């Protein structure tokens, strides 16, 4: 019911690897989701169940973890993939979302 | 020359060996009819057994 994402602002140049972490007050047992709201559009879901990429449109956004610690490590970041990243539990029904991490340009 | 086991061959027609065309690819085929089992009606259904 409480999720906190530690890296509020990260600035990374092209090809930098950026790692983003959000942890939960109680075990969520592999039920977490990460989204990338580009400014001016609605969000898109980037990872579901903490370890599985979704529709497959995202290809390099590997993320991993079980229980309390889940981190989304972007690989060769391209300038286009810069946009706030948000995380929410998907199975406990009083769902909540974290504050968000902005991968801005340097 | 190897078939006659000599370095000298007299004039004539000799059966040196055999020629075989070799398979280009591999095709596996099974029936089109799905004969689908009703796992669909057990795995997902409005209600489940207690």
């Amino acid at each position: 019911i409480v999720l906190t994402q530690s890296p509020s602002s990260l600035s990374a140049s092209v090809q930098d690897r950026v790692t983003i972490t959000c942890r939960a007050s109680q075990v969520i047992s592999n039920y977490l989701a990460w989204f990338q709201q580009k400014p001016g559009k609605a969000p898109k879901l980037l990872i579901y169940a903490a370890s599985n990429l979704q529709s497959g449109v995202p290809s390099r956004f590997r993320g991993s973890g079980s229980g309390t610690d889940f981190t989304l490590t972007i690989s060769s970041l391209q300038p286009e993939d810069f946009a706030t990243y948000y995380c929410q539990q998907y199975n406990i029904y009083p769902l909540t979302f974290g504050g968000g991490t902005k991968v801005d340009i340097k | 020359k190897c078939t006659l086991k000599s370095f000298t061959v007299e004039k004539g027609i000799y059966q040196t060996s055999n020629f075989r065309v070799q398979p280009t690819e591999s095709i596996v085929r099974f029936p089109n009819i799905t004969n689908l089992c009703p796992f669909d009606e057990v795995f997902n259904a409005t209600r489940f057994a207690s």
Partner: protein, 122 residues
């Protein structure tokens, strides 16, 4: 093809209720669950209420309780949310979400919606 276009976006005075119609297209509305997520301006995604496949299951967020009625008419293909009283704080762009998450088949918040710029004014 797949879409969850939304409508009913307009300025509303506080204490006045506007039904928000979240239409559906290119989906089997009955099996997919629908829920509402709101982003206040300059903030982050927040959550409100959920309607199941049968339309028989409703669960609500603690922040607003009993202040909204979420109903899914499959024949209409439209999930409707109406808030009895709208606080000045709730000036968010309401977002509609499609969640297939209990059927051995699906994952959460798969498509999302363009959104309606709800507004509270005085």
């Amino acid at each position: 093809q797949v879409q969850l276009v939304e409508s009913g976006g307009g300025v509303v005075q506080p204490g006045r209720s506007l039904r928000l119609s979240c239409a559906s297209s290119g989906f089997t509305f009955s099996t997919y669950h629908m829920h509402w997520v709101r982003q206040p301006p300059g903030k982050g995604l927040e959550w409100v209420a959920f309607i199941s496949y049968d339309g028989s299951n409703y669960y609500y967020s603690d922040s607003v309780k009993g202040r909204f009625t979420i109903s899914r008419d499959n024949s209409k293909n439209t999930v409707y949310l109406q808030m009895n009283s709208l606080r000045a704080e709730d000036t968010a762009l309401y977002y509609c979400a499609r969640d297939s998450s209990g059927w051995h088949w699906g994952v959460p918040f798969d498509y999302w919606g363009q959104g309606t710029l709800v507004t509270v004014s005085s």
